Swiss-Prot record, chain A:
It is found in: Nucleus, Nucleoplasm; Cytoplasm; Nucleus, Nucleolus; Nucleus. Residues 2-85 form the SWIB/MDM2 domain. Ubiquitous. Isoform Mdm2-A, isoform Mdm2-B, isoform Mdm2-C, isoform Mdm2-D, isoform Mdm2-E, isoform Mdm2-F and isoform Mdm2-G are observed in a range of cancers but absent in normal tissues. It comes from Homo sapiens (Human). MDM2 RING finger mutations that failed to ubiquitinate p53 in vitro did not target p53 for degradation when expressed in cells. This is E3 ubiquitin-protein ligase Mdm2. It is linked to Seems to be amplified in certain tumors (including soft tissue sarcomas, osteosarcomas and gliomas). A higher frequency of splice variants lacking p53 binding domain sequences was found in late-stage and high-grade ovarian and bladder carcinomas. Four of the splice variants show loss of p53 binding. The gene is MDM2. Interacts with p53/TP53, TP73/p73, RBL5 and RP11. Binds specifically to RNA. Can interact with RB1, E1A-associated protein EP300 and the E2F1 transcription factor. Forms a ternary complex with p53/TP53 and WWOX. Interacts with CDKN2AIP, RFWD3, USP7, PYHIN1, and RBBP6. Interacts with ARRB1 and ARRB2. Interacts with PSMA3. Found in a trimeric complex with MDM2, MDM4 and USP2. Interacts with USP2 (via N-terminus and C-terminus). Interacts with MDM4. Part of a complex with MDM2, DAXX, RASSF1 and USP7. Part of a complex with DAXX, MDM2 and USP7. Interacts directly with DAXX and USP7. Residues 1-77 are annotated as: Sufficient to promote the mitochondrial pathway of apoptosis. The chain holds residues 25 to 111 of 491 of the full protein. Residues 1-86 are annotated as: Necessary for interaction with USP2. It comes from the Eukaryota.
Amino acid sequence: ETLVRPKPLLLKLLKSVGAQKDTYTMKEVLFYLGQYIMTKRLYDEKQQHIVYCSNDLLGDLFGAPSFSVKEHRKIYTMIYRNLVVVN
Amino acid sequence: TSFAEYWXXX
C-alpha cells in the first residue's frame, strides 16, 4: 500500500532475480528481496534467520556484514533508505 | 524453520 521506485543499487538487486519494473509496492520489494536471499543462498543453512552478506551486493545495500530476519526495524529502514516513495 | 518461513512474520 506504498508505491516505491527503488534507487539504482536496490533495483540492481531486484533485477538480479528477474524484476522488470520501475515501480513496486513495498510488499513486492520485500518479496523480491527475500527471493534474492534464497536464490543466492545468503541465509545460514542451520539457523536460517541469519543472513551473511559481507561479500555481496546486499551487504553494500545494508552497510553491514550480516543481519537477522528478526531485525524488522533494520530491514525496513535499509529498504526505505534505498527507494523513493510515490506520494 | 526455513528462511522462507522466517521472511514471509518481514
